[PDB]
Design a protein around this ligand. Structure first.
Ligand SMILES: CO[C@H]1O[C@H](CO[C@H]2O[C@H](CO)[C@@H](O)[C@H](O)[C@@H]2O)[C@@H](O)[C@H](O)[C@@H]1O
Ligand SMILES: CO[C@H]1O[C@H](CO[C@H]2O[C@H](CO)[C@@H](O)[C@H](O)[C@@H]2O)[C@@H](O)[C@H](O)[C@@H]1O
Ligand SMILES: CO[C@H]1O[C@H](CO[C@H]2O[C@H](CO)[C@@H](O)[C@H](O)[C@@H]2O)[C@@H](O)[C@H](O)[C@@H]1O
Ligand SMILES: CO[C@H]1O[C@H](CO[C@H]2O[C@H](CO)[C@@H](O)[C@H](O)[C@@H]2O)[C@@H](O)[C@H](O)[C@@H]1O
Ligand SMILES: [Ca+2]
Ligand SMILES: [Ca+2]
Ligand SMILES: [Ca+2]
Ligand SMILES: [Ca+2]
Ligand SMILES: [Cl-]
Ligand SMILES: [Mn+2]
Ligand SMILES: [Mn+2]
Ligand SMILES: [Mn+2]
Ligand SMILES: [Mn+2]
Lengths: 237, 237, 237, 237
């Protein structure tokens, strides 16, 4: 199936499957059962920022999530992406809701990837920045319920006409061009992703969360991955 | 058919269709018959650099082609791209040979596009830089005889095993992701493209040329566009 | 004395000295009497954006000023900066008030300059971006009444504790490092500057304006340059 | 005195003071006796590249030094720069020779710094790239024997008219503008430095080395810091 490396911003604790008993951010390597998690003081209705970084020298995937004037949550995990992902991948954002729901609104998203060749010592680079999403954003592959243009935002999961989030929704947005994430002959390689989001929920328990992911080029939403599986995994193994 | 805006580095003068009687660089707007040209002292076997710029404030497309320690050739043309191209396009490089030939080798290629919206005054941007091309360059759509990986270069037209260029060849390389080149609510929109090339020819008259182009997203090589047509136009009109 | 090239956002019409009879943007080359102006529909109390561009190929200094969802004002003037400015300069923002006043608040400021060698075809570049100004911004040279840190903004002219603008004020802010704006052996040189401002006035006629400027490295506020002189010129000649 | 954090490319082993018995790269925190070192297969007369990265999330300073088609040497050290350096600093390059010598030629140098505020979540950034050094490089503070312009290169240490390196030389080059390396209210802060060098020596043992360093703004070369002190420290403690 698909190979997924993801940083999840999990708003709903699903303890039956390994989740700690509070909202949290985690690093998922081919499984929804986070290799490492951190407590996340999610604020309903506020705009927050997630920053994801990695480099081939340190081989550490790190993420910082925060809201203005509040403490940030950080999670890091040592992982050599060379052994996990194919050299060419697609990057994207995914979100879901189940019995409980929330808006999974993306207000901005940027990504920078750099590869320095050992033979050449010159760099190949890719950078994209979205601060506005149009109703016909052709450089984005929208999967599931994901839509763009509403107020210039990216809505990963279904929201009704009047602005209310729907349950049992799943959606993803992948950047159109494949990304060369690693290469055997590379001296240094690194990527950095940033996105601002707005998670808002009418009910007591918001669910299920947002995730920045890296996958094989032809990745598709596994059937039935609504809710706990965050639109990324086919099962809870 | 296709909508094409291109900057050509024409090495072969086809006077029957409007070419000046010497190698030159030109700005082509929907026709191979350049709106503006400038004399170009092409140097057989030397590595050159081409720099193309445009901004929606001035509405002027400019290109500078030069070799290290030599005079540069410059050509500019006032054109409002909103009236010629669709708002979403693909960018690429094209080349061809005919009775006469030449290698149409690309050693590097970079492009940067920016769009500042009117509703938000926030910018969307795209940037890619290739200084090395691998044998499996998944973020390039290769058309015709174009290939990559040979010495880390991009060969737009057919070259034999021993390095000799072939005639009646046409090839193009387009960046995988569509580019939002303009929008009605844009305060400013600009792009910049740079590429280094190596044109080498065994015969007295090198042909036919290399071109940086912008087209509709689904653009493909028009049949019989070898030689003078540079793999861009269906006829000489 | 000083050599000044500037783009003014002139809010007060001083018809005695050439100003047209309405708010306007203009290009000033060594004199407060602009070489070219354009009507500017200034909006009291709204945040606007100014974008200034120039390149050595077209040798045209262009500027666009606009407010979200409003028409933009544009002004362009052909000028070869090599003949006017020394090769090493400082870039900054200046503002003033006189009998009438306004806040001359700068919310963000970025600048990018690139010089490309003819010998090498390689680039030297400088880029800075301020989206926040701290109380002790060591990379900015503040002159006159300019201060930083208040709400993380840069106040070019005097503003009272309660937020009310004072008359007869003048202040500037220059980036600390000299900038290599042009070079004889350069193939292509270009610069781009962007700043967001907030001009708010309690009285009927706001005055006097804000200006982006380029000057010799050791430039200082000319004595008596409040009001119509915008902290840039010693007289109205 | 001064506060120095440096990455040294030490070519001469001074075993009395801690150096391992071979050329190496190391991370120095307020002392010439490196906290961590790694064997470095220095190649006399070849052009190499040094890449230094740091981010405040991982709080790890890493450096990779290599030559095209050769293995790289890597060294990392966990250090929270907030506890050692002031929030504003100057960045530079230093080099020295003693009884033995070498050319300490810098061919290129780039640096990028970014600081994201907690209060706002907006980034302040600084970027400079030098691929050519001119005879009057006004944005560099040259100290000691350092000079620029020769072939467009930066010579940190004294080289005679005929290209031969001198002994007992020391020199540094610092970027003119102070750099905001950290802040209490920062969500993320990171920097990346890259430079290409050419170490060539006529004698059997090249000495003494090159260092990328970060210091207090008003740092100057300590007197007598030739040889093993690399133009950075007053003594060997
Ligand atoms: C009723 O208890 C069980 O089911 C609960 C509901 O589970 C759905 O909703 C979740 C939150 O949106 C989602 O994560 C899950 O996949 C289901 O779609 C659940 O809260 C309990 O933990 C339990 O499994
Ligand atoms: C026989 O003369 C005519 O054809 C000549 C050859 O034309 C081919 O080769 C050209 C150069 O490679 C190319 O531009 C053209 O499209 C054909 O592929 C031509 O050189 C003469 O000018 C004339 O048209
Ligand atoms: C008395 O009329 C003359 O002076 C008036 C006041 O001029 C001051 O205020 C102006 C607006 O702040 C400023 O531009 C000028 O330099 C003086 O500080 C002026 O309004 C009239 O136009 C006239 O010059
Ligand atoms: C007498 O042997 C000792 O000193 C030698 C000379 O030391 C000078 O030169 C060194 C190499 O350039 C330099 O590192 C040092 O600071 C002095 O300037 C040295 O070569 C021997 O290894 C030994 O320490
Ligand atoms: Ca969960
Ligand atoms: Ca032709
Ligand atoms: Ca005026
Ligand atoms: Ca040593
Ligand atoms: Cl000593
Ligand atoms: Mn989880
Ligand atoms: Mn032509
Ligand atoms: Mn005026
Ligand atoms: Mn050492």
């Amino acid at each position: 199936a698909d190979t997924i490396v993801a940083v999840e911003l999990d708003t709903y604790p699903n303890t039956d499957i390994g989740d700690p008993s509070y909202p949290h951010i985690g690093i998922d390597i081919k499984s929804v059962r986070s290799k490492k998690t951190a407590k996340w003081n999610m604020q309903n209705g506020k705009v927050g920022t997630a920053h994801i970084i990695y480099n081939s020298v340190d081989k550490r995937l790190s993420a910082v999530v925060s809201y203005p004037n509040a403490d940030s949550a950080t999670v890091s995990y040592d992982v050599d992406l060379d052994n996990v992902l194919p050299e060419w991948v697609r990057v994207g954002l995914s979100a879901s809701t189940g019995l409980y729901k929330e808006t999974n609104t993306i207000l901005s998203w940027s990504f920078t990837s750099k590869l320095k060749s050992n033979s050449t010592h010159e760099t190949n680079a890719l950078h994209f920045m979205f601060n506005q999403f149009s109703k016909d954003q052709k450089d984005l592959i929208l999967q599931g319920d994901a839509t763009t243009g509403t107020d210039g935002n990216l809505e990963l999961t279904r929201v009704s006409s009047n602005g209310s989030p729907q349950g049992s929704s799943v959606g993803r947005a992948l950047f159109y061009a494949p990304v060369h994430i690693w290469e055997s002959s590379a001296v240094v390689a690194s990527f950095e992703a940033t996105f601002t989001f707005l998670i808002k929920s009418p009910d007591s328990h918001p669910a299920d969360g947002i995730a920045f992911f890296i996958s094989n080029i032809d990745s598709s939403i596994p059937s039935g991955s609504t809710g706990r599986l965050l639109g990324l995994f086919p099962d809870a193994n």
